[model samples]
Target chain A: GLVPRGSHMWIGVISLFPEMFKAITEFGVTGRAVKHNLLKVECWNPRDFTFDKHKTVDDRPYGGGPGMLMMVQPLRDAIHTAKAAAGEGAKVIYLSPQGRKLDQGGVTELAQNQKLILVCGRYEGIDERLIQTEIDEEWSIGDYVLTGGELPAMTLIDAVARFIPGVLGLLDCPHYTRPEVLEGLTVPPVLMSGHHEEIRKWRLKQSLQRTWLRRPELLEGLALTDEQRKLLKEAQAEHNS
Target chain B: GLVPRGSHMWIGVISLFPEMFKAITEFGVTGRAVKHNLLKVECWNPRDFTFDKHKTVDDRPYGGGPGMLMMVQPLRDAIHTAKAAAGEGAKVIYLSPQGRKLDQGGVTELAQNQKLILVCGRYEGIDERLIQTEIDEEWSIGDYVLTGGELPAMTLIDAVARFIPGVLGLLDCPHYTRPEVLEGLTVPPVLMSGHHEEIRKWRLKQSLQRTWLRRPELLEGLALTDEQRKLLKEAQAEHNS
Candidate 1:
């Protein structure tokens, strides 16, 4: 079994462009997690395992639509290889527009998995039969279509990696590094007044205010204490005025 | 004014790790789109615009939180430079959870931009003040937290690129390419039936069944017609039986 917190988690990717995965080996905090052995990711291309001379992995759809449906044989075979390489109890996740919306909570859960076999589809999609038999689940980064699923796969990788213990330096605190270039930095008046208590109050208010502005629905779930409510009201009053 | 529908829409980014973007230059249909002169992208590292040694820009938060706050001055200057380079009517979007969700609809609307200035925040975050004033908008790929905004920016670029005229070949089609693999010849019996009409029924039913299961919400807006409803029921019957 993989570590519950995703340390040394094994992620196997079935993709056409291995270079995309390789390139991610050097990008972002996810890159550092891989470099430090906090995690491992392997890329498998259907093209490399194909039997034909042209190394084509896609074929015309039986029902008919545009672009090629990645042929089932190469795709299914590639996933089998990837999952088998991933070891026991590895969940096969296909990135698709139809998959459940990924969120911070989803990242928390996915990070606990010992292994993940992520299948990235290109063109129209993989043959439906392949999806019916092989996939354990699907993950969509959003509703928009990209040329391929690599970026969504990378998104999952990056978000999940943040949950690993060694992955974050300052996970909770939201401190600032004011480079002297902005010495005239006019921090909120309360902070300048040397009021330590008000600073916490203001940040919590801002976090609430921000979540309110963009994701008002989220405020529906927040358990705001009476004190917090007052803070929110004060912030709202300030904003309006 | 810029070309309509992302034709030559300029995308600029301010981030620390420019390499994270280098891979995108050649990674998907979007890569080819950019290569063929359908899109233009440029990256400006905030580090490049820093005024001090160590090229330091971020500093400690005044109110106090974990992680470095990207310095207001360097971050602002870089974005200003990026915007100026992008020319008129450019929209500066900061990627964050507070931003509106990016969806297919979002991509379509963004495609109208003549230019885009994407500010990728690192560390805990950038100065909140800067975000309030300088950013035209913010876009969140999903609700999960990321180490930086780089991936989200890439997501926008890739999604927007897909909307460029002539950027997509199978924009409306979903055809499959028959392959010679499997049993060196084991095509699905359904497909092998040589009953093209029967295969069409199977494909349509399955497509409807899948949408029914995974993206039922999409169906609410899919504007299904009578034949589409018939195919959906046929799929339901098979599953139920």
Candidate 2:
């Protein structure tokens, strides 16, 4: 319920090294948001929340493996505390390689959410049981692997924050609206066209087409209106031409 | 020609945002090196080396596409300048998704080099003609895609810098020495064993077995001596046991 420009879009991140989140506040598009006070980035170290003297947050997986799995209880508590602090109803997102691949549409959807609680796991990963029970959604920045979730969390924040109104400045925001028409390995032509209406139509069409080609599964529950279907058809015909 | 802890492994990165390299210097494992003066990272902005006031570093690809490719001339000049500063015989590496997938072995190999020149291309990528002529190697951090090469560059630096003496500390160095033994997804049991001789033999055997299982190509050029071959055979037998 925080309006754009009036207050910050609160994001609470649960990570082992809270300082890692500082990367967001210091660089790139996300950094600009932090500088403008358009986004409030907070970090919660689960280790600080742990009751044990050792601050042990990970253990060997139940199935047994090389690396440790993050203990469920501490993560659950961290998420709960983060959500509570951000105020209730904040969506809890866990960043994992196995999560749904994040794209423009997902970025747009998340941007609309008032608050986000990002859980960053280390070692092997978080407990599967905890993820199923505690997490509201899972997002993977891409198909590759990393040592941990800190970078993906930053990626998600940058992408989602860019879509929030008044966050990207007017000129940059318009640039984001333009679509590329070329499919597969090539970029779309609409991005370079001088005509605004053609560019807008091309972008929307290409967005749908690209998503269809690259990640068809993401469109499963999406409801396409008659007009949108017509636009998709037109975009496909244009691409073919 | 460089020895451990004696001189920095100069990595000249060609990227649009030179400041992005600060991402490595500011945090995590890489940050630890910078803090201790064990690693030195430098960025060369093609734009800075450009001759014109426009300072343009990218151009439309020869074939029409969504994103622009980094221009050749400015990038070439920047790389040469960085190379000259790094002294002779520095390897020029370009980071791309299509390049050789970076693994622990790749990291170790890079660590041995005294100087490295990393080209972080943006948009569609660099001109193929330029890469063919100027770049020595192409390395990919993983299968995933990010906005640019800065993240991969940092990842590579962190992975390689750990090999530098005094960076991770002497006691922890042994832990990383036989990373190949970790196998495709398993940690070698020898790490858990207390006996020094058994640990050494177990590590050698596991190293060969694990590499054979997950990345046979890495072993293609190896002219395995009798001792190594025996160890491999022993390791194989133990693995089966």
Candidate 3:
């Protein structure tokens, strides 16, 4: 576990491939967060807890399966070690296909916690007993299968870190710059109008239009203001036309 | 640009942080695929196309904004260069928040392409012209904002590579191993029984039961055989009880 003194988020990751977690800690916004002492991550390899010459952490599944499963004892010991090190109240989450779907809201919820223990299952998965007894929650990044939970855990950490205080801010709309006209494509004329109010209105309209076009379901339940609703209606009409 | 000769899938990436892609190319199943010459990935950094001493690739958004926008020329040039290198019929795909949601089905579809050009945007996003002129499709991993698209690109590659022939196969149910009883948790009795027919029936029922409990929508339109239907009904009744 690499701990930056006084970090806001502490994460204990149980994985077979601990070095892969470096991808997040050494790159992008998450990287900055780690360097700034906003986030801390520690990796605990299940194989380390295994008492064998090969340091084996997985074994053949009962009743027959093509792939192996993480043996219970090593993984369970690893989880307990992380738990004791993280102090009390660290939520244990297993990244798996059969779990709660992860979204922006879920990321937000997970970020509020001071500590988290993420279990990354490879091959078939871990023993069901380990999950039933140890896991606090199960989360899936999406409805796709990757080789292991390492990537999904990285993705979760990256997304969750963005919500940590002083990490980052804002989603954005489109922007254009110098040589506005290039390759026969022109920047939207309103941005060039030199009218601040006009630019603001145009930007808002574009936001509504783009959202209505790409993710219209987002508009369904929202409490849109009068101006926004009218703007969305205009955008909708233009699209239909 | 890294290429394994005679690769089955070729991908050209346009990004500012091209090295971030090493997360996928140097680890896990995708790593194995690259080693086996089943997948090839080449990255073109937009900054390389910048002419200034600063080697700038972004500019302040027109009409005022909080963050900079990826300037058109450098990104556009990078895309063109990658397209040329990837040869004809390479579908350019942009990863963005305002795009088609990605799923297992989408991963499968993308994997079928022999050549794909993935553009990863940073800051606010790339110029609208680049998307309009070059991109054939846009994809979103889920409804969450990250620092950038590098992780998403890595994730996309990881998932897509799994679908490439011989990269990997199969999603799985839970598995249990030796010392079936540990810490007061026991493996299911049926799996311990030596009757092959009984074990098969137990595994199928558990699969149905687990899916019904976790992701019932999967079974909504799936074509289930008669035995599976009966088993699922029994599982449902047990759950309801």
Candidate 4:
């Protein structure tokens, strides 16, 4: 029954702070993607799913802990509604510190999904049963805590959007602009020499050197060209001296 | 001259979009921290340091890339001003992909500092020379790209704030509330048994199971109690069966 959909990337966010998404949906490449109709984003607040006097979406944990946990009912209802609107194949992802760590590879894979339903938890977390039944996947940005999952949802969207068509990508090499000299620091002479091949080699070497220096672990399993290996060795030699 | 600070953490951000910080400084625990004066945040826009009529902070990369690279002049000047205002002991951190990956331990360490200057890059990145000469350290939230570093800066601030004296802390267990059962899913029997010791054991085992199932690497060096180990083994056996 769920056909005639899935051409564009459709993302549904289940969040209390739905307005916070404006930081991404209205800015930069993601914003541009939204404007160009390349990406579609909608928000579903759990509060809207509540049928209570105070419209209370969060409540104290059963075992008792530091903060409130999003109650199961509203979040479950919101998820069901979101999934139905998103159709049969939409994956429900809960952003939490307990999930698999997000990386560039994960971003690329997540971008392949045509539709996604992201649950952004506020306060502590949602009831574990809801996660066991409703969530298709759980992902974390890092090993630290934030006030809520709204930022992580925004972050995941921004990262994944880069892999989607009509967006952007990459680990940039150094960049220098106009005012060739500033505060006694001059742009590398080679950048101004108008030698394209030399400039490319310079950039490639600088990139290799930088990766080696800052994050050697990143280079461990990376496929490197002969030229890159040579450049990295040179950088290592220079640094050791 | 720089001795006055070192009380109540001061964070200075150098970025093109200083307003993006409102997302954090006005919400959640970090917002409360700011309101209560436990944290002090100030922004220095690189655009303010630009001398050009366009107030141009970014320009074409030397080797020619997909996006503009932030100029060295403005960013350097801004960093200097931020540092001076942050006092002599401020550690200048440039948020970039080519930096140390941030984690809980890093967040805890960072929170110990009395003053910090964060440089948030826009467009491609700041001139390499600016990073080399001005930055004391570089940090990355994860291995993904965003439109800019503003969100990452906000994320870093939120995470670090938790480790501050009066902010918050975490790895939560499940939570449930109000109606005893919802849509056929009942709250775990143990949580409502009114037995405190049983609840503690159940919560601990669940936390151990979650950590073991989702991210075992996290448990590799974790000093687990004998009871935790036993619970983890039982969880493992149940899964295997």
Writing each residue's lDDT as its tens digit, candidate 1 over B72-130 gives 77788899888788778888898877678887778889998868888888877776667
Which residue pairs in candidate 4 have backbone atoms (N, alpha carbon, C) closer than 3 angstroms, thus clashing? none
* Tens digit per residue, CA lDDT, model 3, B1-241: 3544444889899988877777778876788888888889999998999999999887887777677778878988999999899898799999987889888779989888989999998887887777778999999887777778877888888888877766651224567887778678788888888778998877778788888887776777668989989988998999899
Docking class of 1: acceptable
lDDT of 2 at B184: 40
lDDT of 4 by residue, A1-241 (tens): 2223335688999998777788777776788889877788999999899899999988887766566888778888999899889987799999999888998778888998989999999887887777778999999998787889988988999887776665542355677886777667888888898899899888888887777777666687778889888877887899899
Each candidate: fraction of true contacts kept? 0.64, 0.02, 0.66, 0.70
Candidate DockQ scores, in order: 0.44, 0.06, 0.60, 0.55
Tens-place lDDT digits, model 2, residues A166-227? 65300010112112321223233454556677766655665577555544554576788776
Candidate 3 Cα deviation (angstroms), residue A148? 0.8
* Model with the higher DockQ, candidate 2 or 3: 3
The CA lDDT at A9 in model 1 is 75
Between prediction 3 and prediction 4, the one with superior lDDT is 3
Which window of ten consecutive residues has the lowest lDDT sum in model 3 chain A? A166-175
lDDT by residue (A1-241, candidate 1, tens digit) is 2434545778999999878775457876778878878878998999888898999887776544455678777888899898778778899998977678887778888988968999999887875546556888878888778878888998888888777777651013223445422445455666556678878776677776666666766667568889868877887898889
- Which parts of model 1 have CA positions greater than 4 angstroms off? A1-6, A169-185, A220-241, B1-6, B169-213, B219-241
For model 3, report DockQ.
0.60
